[PDB]
Design a protein around this ligand. Structure first.
Ligand code: CL
Ligand code: CL
Ligand code: CL
Ligand code: CL
Ligand code: CL
Ligand code: ZN
Ligand code: ZN
Lengths: 333, 335
């Protein structure tokens, strides 16, 4: 029965309240911090894209097509459909001998307002390349092509790619990922509900290598380093996931998920983080991931300060007037 | 007292996300017909109570002096998309008070509606104060001031005669105490007074019924509610919940959204007022919750009930158009 994790104030008062759950786990699976119910299956949605990109790396497809940090970042991305994202994804497909028509994710306008205005002014309609999951889906197609697997139907539950992804995520998290746990994601691929505890543990393991074979440990290390090295390619302009990974370069891994999921790691402390705003609000998940991270940087005041700017964000109206704050509650203390 | 789960968002076989909330349904006499959760704790009505804020426009006689039909009264009660028709009409309402866009103190922003925003972006460098979802309410405020020879400059300020009047009107409609402690600044820079959901609902029941109101306030309230139901495009716009909900049973259902997951409603013919809040402020929950609450009163009107249940239980389709799960008001709305 989940505690209030974020308050949203106006004048002297709380106007809105979010409840959520948080799991912080080390490489060995030891629990360092928890809020609310970390045992009920939650859909990680986009928060677990890095786990899904392991096939791209472990298959040798990354090395074969000359993917560096930018390409791997995109594979792990919910991007804004900025031209830089669109041209990188086209490039990943091109090097595999494919193009946009291979994408099975469908098209949508940026979920960033500033980026949508630019799209609206430069395009008649978005393409599948503008889909926030185009880099992941381009990873998928590249993984298939490299291995001589026809990418057609790569979204299918019993396509060999999704078979491999399910086995990989079972191994990382120790969760049972089958029909019971399964739903269709925004891009038409499977997403697998699992306890927050197991999702945090999966991330701790990618972060530490603990419990993984060398190949999976190495491929996990490359994916995380790539996201922290090219955080723009994970999200883009004005995005929480990009800015959070610019506070302490190379030290903090974060990834947003649809419906208020966040995953994080701090490799150097060997911890994985997962959390869920019960109502699925993004603003709550952002404030909660910042408050949770800040616990581990209390001794580093400029990093703590930067994190607290997301844990306690001012809101201004259309005239620029401060009206209240979105703030993580004292349960983070 | 903890708020019950009012809305579930499903994916595959599971609940993906849950919203908690509160609902009050009150008649003209203040009798409670239906409630969920805490309807006693102060909540900010935000734009949900624009119809009450429009009383000075009508009761001053400003609406009649400036030739306002149902469209102008609807816009005055509106959180509109900033479509061409809303922008022109706001501009007309100001023009009749001897004013223009510079008179507006609400500031500018791009459309609440994505499709309208794409249109705005393609045809404008930046939006003006006229494009602001509250520009009709603000044009009304300025017109009420100009008609009475009150200087509209600083019309947003707490002790400006308009704001003093709005507090007095809203205390009379709601029976709520609206002072400094309850006050916040709204998205449009005017005051917004947190009050119990029960008091908000009662205020709408009284506008809906005339019960407890002096003849002039009773008449002015009937005019505002009628205009909103007569011209629901002007209350919101293309694609909008508020417009579509008032096109289900033309002239019979009043609704209005508020920022942070508020809805207010009335069904004048059943003598009832409705208020509600998604505790987490989610629009999608408040929409599901107002549709389920309205549906309770139309169960034997199968076309209307079905049309309302299309908002209370709604399929989610992904970018490829595949059904992935539902946004559904829970069963506490049937019990
Ligand atoms: Cl996105
Ligand atoms: Cl392994
Ligand atoms: Cl650093
Ligand atoms: Cl003008
Ligand atoms: Cl009265
Ligand atoms: Zn996706
Ligand atoms: Zn307003």
């Amino acid at each position: 029965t989940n505690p209030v994790t974020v308050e949203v104030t106006r004048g002297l008062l709380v106007e809105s309240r979010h409840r959520g759950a948080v799991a912080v786990v080390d490489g060995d699976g030891k629990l360092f911090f928890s809020l609310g119910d970390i045992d009920t299956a939650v859909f990680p949605r986009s928060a677990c894209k890095a786990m899904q990109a392991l096939p791209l790396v472990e298959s040798g497809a990354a090395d074969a097509y000359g993917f560096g940090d930018k390409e791997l970042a995109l594979a792990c991305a919910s991007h804004n459909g900025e031209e830089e994202h669109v041209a990188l994804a086209a490039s990943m497909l091109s090097r595999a001998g494919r193009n946009v028509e291979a994408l099975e994710c469908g098209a949508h306008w940026s979920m960033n307002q500033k980026v949508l205005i630019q799209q609206a002014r430069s395009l008649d309609a978005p393409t599948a390349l503008h889909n926030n999951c185009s880099g992941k889906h381009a990873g998928f197609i590249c993984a298939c092509c490299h291995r001589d697997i026809d990418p057609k139907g790569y979204v299918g539950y019993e396509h060999p790619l999704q078979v491999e992804i399910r086995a990989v995520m079972e191994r990382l998290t120790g969760a049972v990922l089958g029909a019971e746990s399964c739903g269709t994601d925004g891009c038409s691929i499977p997403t697998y509900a699992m306890p927050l505890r197991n999702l945090a543990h999966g991330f701790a393991r990618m972060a530490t290598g603990t419990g993984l074979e060398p190949l999976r440990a190495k491929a996990s290390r490359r994916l995380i380093e790539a996201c922290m090295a090219e955080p723009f390619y994970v999200a883009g302009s004005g995005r929480a996931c990009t800015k959070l990974m610019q506070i302490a370069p190379g030290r903090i891994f974060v990834k947003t998920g649809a419906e208020g999921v966040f995953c994080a790691a701090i490799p150097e402390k060997g911890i994985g983080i997962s959390l869920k705003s019960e109502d699925g609000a993004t603003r709550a998940a952002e404030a909660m991931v910042a408050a949770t991270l800040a616990r581990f940087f209390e001794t580093e005041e400029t990093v703590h300060a930067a994190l607290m700017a997301f844990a306690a964000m001012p809101m201004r109206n259309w005239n620029g007037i401060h009206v209240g704050d979105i703030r993580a509650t004292s349960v983070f203390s």
